[PDB]
Amino acid sequence: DEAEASKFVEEYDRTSQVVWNEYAGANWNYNTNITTETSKILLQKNMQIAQHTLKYGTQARKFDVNQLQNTTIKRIIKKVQDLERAALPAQELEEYNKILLDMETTYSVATVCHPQGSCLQLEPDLTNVMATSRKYEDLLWAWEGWRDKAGRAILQFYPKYVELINQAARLNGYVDAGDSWRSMYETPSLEQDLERLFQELQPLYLNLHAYVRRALHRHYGAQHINLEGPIPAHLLGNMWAQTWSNIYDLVVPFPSAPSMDTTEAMLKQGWTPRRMFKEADDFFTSLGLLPVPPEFWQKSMLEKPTDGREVVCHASAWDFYNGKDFRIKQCTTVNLEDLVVAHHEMGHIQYFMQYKDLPVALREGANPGFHEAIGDVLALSVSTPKHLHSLNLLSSEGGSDEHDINFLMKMALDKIAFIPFSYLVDQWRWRVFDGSITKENYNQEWWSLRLKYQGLCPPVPRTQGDFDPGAKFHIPSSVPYIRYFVSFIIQFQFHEALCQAAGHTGPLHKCDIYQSKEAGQRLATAMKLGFSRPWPEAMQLITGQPQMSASAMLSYFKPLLDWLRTENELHGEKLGWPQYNWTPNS
Ligand SMILES: *[C@@H]1O[C@H](CO[C@@H]2O[C@@H](C)[C@@H](O)[C@@H](O)[C@@H]2O)[C@@H](O[C@@H]2O[C@H](CO)[C@@H](O[C@@H]3O[C@H](CO[C@H]4O[C@H](CO)[C@@H](O)[C@H](O)[C@@H]4O)[C@@H](O)[C@H](O[C@H]4O[C@H](CO)[C@@H](O)[C@H](O)[C@@H]4O)[C@@H]3O)[C@H](O)[C@H]2NC(C)=O)[C@H](O)[C@H]1NC(C)=O
Ligand SMILES: O=C(NCC(=O)N1[C@@H](c2cccc(O)c2)CC[C@H]1C(=O)O)[C@@H](S)Cc1ccc(O)cc1
Ligand SMILES: *[C@@H]1O[C@H](CO)[C@@H](O)[C@H](O)[C@H]1NC(C)=O
Ligand SMILES: [Cl-]
Ligand SMILES: [Cl-]
Ligand SMILES: [Zn+2]
């Protein structure tokens, strides 16, 4: 009996490597070359991999997992019993695959056009507008235009997507798709734990929000910013107001401590997308971690194609399930923001390489947030003024309190501002999946949460037909989002532990773990576990303790919280948005 279970997982592993490797190649080809042909082939591979999943998932369900003794085999079989979309009847499965393909293609090819003028894509064109324009009406054009063209066009698909993804989840023993997604963390207390973490970061976020709101009031005018209300959502330098670092120039704490233009520095010094990924590779290997294989450099897509091909530009990392072939797909732009993204994606590749010898059912991160956090941890060190100066992208900014607070502010605009956004995305989707939000109030409930958690308001009142969640990649692409909230909490925990491992002393935000073999060994031992053990074990290997905790992030930003409280108190800011019902008059 035990022996039948072992043979089963051995046969599952052999056949899954072959089938998954073939699917990965067809998915890569559509993603790097959106055409009618590659679409058709992808859909055919969907059915071939569904046939495999159904064959083996049906066998796995014949095992009473309770009677199995070996915990690793127990764990693999339990996972294989979840067929995901392959549980759907053939008709519904075909419909679901086409729905996902149609949503992804619609988002990827959407454009915003001036009347008898240029037509702009999201990347790079509209993202550049949101990042650099300081004109209220030009920002509004790009903000509304993207939602009009991308979001509104996804709405026709979303109710059917929800019905089918929930149907699949119920057929695999869950109550709805959000239940299925949350179960990937294997943490019954997940919702309460995340809410406790969110509340711990409220002092920092509320003080940052009030400080930024005052600076926007200075620039965009008292008639357009309510100092006791929510912030208009198009003024934060980013299409989704999920990171605010592009308005640093408007909110710099000490303008007498100017910082070099890092984009112009990268461009003036002939940086390229390949250089950016090569620097990321060197950081990983300085820790004693693994280099990406030569094949990686020949097969990856590290910039947008010149030949006009439609592609999925959103950055992503690809495991082809043969232990040899790993790739990144990114429409890379030469700036600091994309340098961080490059490290993010290279962290995925490192995880792939570290757990490549596990059975494929266990070739995942300890939980989804762990997978998203690895590259971000290294990027925290890359972003320090000391490291950027070593790359000739900043002048020597050391030993200045003013430069110190300026750097903490730059980091806060990315890391702290993202916390409430990363929280609310799946608060919304979980309630869509469980039926608390219907298609009659998709958009109203999205903005209720944008207000409640981020303190933002739409610059233009929304109307029937709007589907603003559809204008955010992960919604039409059906990529879970709470992983990024988890990642942003634990990456600071990891940073703090690795800095301690490296012998660093003094303020956590001054730590640079470059070349620390001790830091590397912490990360490798945990990554090698893949998904073979509950994630608290990986947390323990890295940090010396088993819990998710906001204390490290709070420690990192403590000098900024002190400065923000003093600054906001001096100006008499009312934290939060008591006038929560305010929206722009013009
Ligand atoms: C419960 O079952 C677990 C799974 O058992 C395996 O899978 C099942 C389905 C059957 O096929 C069974 O025959 C398999 O063994 C089992 O966990 C396994 O435990 C063994 C030890 O008993 C581990 O063996 C170690 O393997 C690593 C390498 O494995 C991978 O990498 C190599 C290199 O690429 C590949 O060739 C392999 O195919 C794997 O992909 C070895 O490096 C390691 O040797 C090192 O450690 C030994 C001491 O153990 C030293 O003497 C050496 O010098 C090395 O330093 C081991 O040989 C195996 O990794 C592990 N698998 C998993 C997935 O965890 C578990 O033990 C069972 N539980 C109980 C209570 O029995
Ligand atoms: O995470 C992915 N890119 C990064 C990313 O999107 N973000 C993360 C970020 C952005 C920038 C810098 C960072 O340090 C991290 C967090 C926000 C969030 C955001 O931009 O909204 C791919 S790996 C996700 C995927 C895509 C397609 C798939 O088929 C499977 C997975
Ligand atoms: C894109 O896909 C089409 C159809 O499969 C194919 O003919 C063409 O060679 C592909 N182009 C690239 C650059 O891969
Ligand atoms: Cl929005
Ligand atoms: Cl997730
Ligand atoms: Zn990622």
Q: Write the secondary structure of 447-459 as one string of H (helix), E (strand) and C (coil).
A: HHHHHHHHCEECC
State which of 314, 318, 477 you would mutate to test the pocket of ligand 2, scoring each by most atoms of that ligand within 8 A of its C-beta: 314
Is ligand 3 within 6 A of the CB of residue 38? yes
> What spacing in Å lies between the alpha carbon of 368 and ligand 5's midpoint?
5
H-type alpha helices, 391-481: 401-433, 442-449
Maximum distance among all Cα pairs of the chain, rounded to whole angstroms: 75
Any atom of ligand 3 within 6 Å of the Cβ of 33: yes
Give the resolution to one decimal, in Å.
Answer: 1.8
Query: Following DSSP, what letter does each residue of 246-315 receive, concatenated?
Result: GGHHHH-S-TTS----HHHHHHHTT--HHHHHHHHHHHHHHTT-PPPPHHHHHH-B-S--TT------S-
Show the tokens assigned to 372.
């998203």
Query: What is d(CA 407, CA 385) in angstroms, rounded to the nearest whole number?
Result: 8
- Give binding residues as ranges: 147, 185, 344, 348, 372, 446, 450, 483
Q: Are 111 and 149 in contact (CB under 8 A)?
A: yes
Cβ(286) – ligand 1 distance below 6 Å: no
Alpha helices per DSSP H over 310-400: 336-354, 368-382, 385-390
DSSP string for residues in 31-69: HTS--HHHHHHHHHHHHHHHHHHHHHHHHHTTS-GGG--
Can 337 be counted among the known catalytic residues? Answer: no
Tell me which ligand sits closest to the C-alpha of residue 529.
1
Beta bridge pairs of residue 452: none
Beta-carbon neighbour count of residue 256 at 10 Å?
Answer: 8
Category of 25 on φ-ψ map: left (φ > 0), alpha (ψ -120 to 50) or beta: alpha
Cα(33) to centroid of ligand 3, in Å? Answer: 6
Q: Which residues of 545-580 are buried (b: 16+ CB within 10 A; e: fewer)?
A: eeebbbebbebbbeebbebbeebbeeeebebbbeee
Q: What's the token pair of residue 552?
A: 């490290």
Neighbouring C-beta atoms of residue 527, cutoff 10 Å: 25
Q: How far apart are CA 530 and CA 211, in angstroms?
A: 41
Counted residue by residue, the chain has a size of 586
**Ligand 1 centroid distance, CA of 356 (Å):** 13
Q: Is 474 a catalytic residue?
A: yes
CB contact at 8 A, 250 and 215 = yes
CB proximity list for 260: less than 8 A, separation 6 or greater: 393, 394, 395
At 155, list the tokens. Answer: 């709405």
Pocket test for ligand 2, best of 107, 320, 341, 421 (most atoms within 8 A of CB): 341
CA trace torsion 227, 228, 231, 237 (10° rounding): 40
Atom 29 in ligand 1: residue holding the nearest Cα: 357
Atom of ligand 3 nearest to the CA of 41: 5
Ligand 2 nearest atom to the CA of residue 376, by list position: 14
- The minimum-distance atom of ligand 3 relative to the CA of 33 is 1
Alpha carbons 327 and 298: distance in angstroms, whole number = 9
Ligand 2 atom closest to 484 (CA): 16
Contacts of 348 (CB under 8 A, 6+ apart): 317, 328, 371, 374, 375
- CA nearest to 132, candidates 202, 235, 13, 208: 235
Containing 231, the helix (H) or strand (E) segment is strand 231-232
Return the amino acid letter for 333: T
d(CA 163, CA 171): 12
CA distance 225 to 250: 14
Q: How far is the CA of 316 from the centre of ligand 6 (A)?
A: 6
Q: For residue 169, report the distance from its CA to the centre of ligand 5, in Å.
A: 15
Q: Which residues have C-beta under 5 Å from ligand 5, the single-atom ion?
A: 368, 480, 482-483
Catalytic residue among 104, 123, 345, 397: 345
Q: Please indicate whether residue 37, judged by its CB atom, sits closer than 6 Å to ligand 3.
A: yes
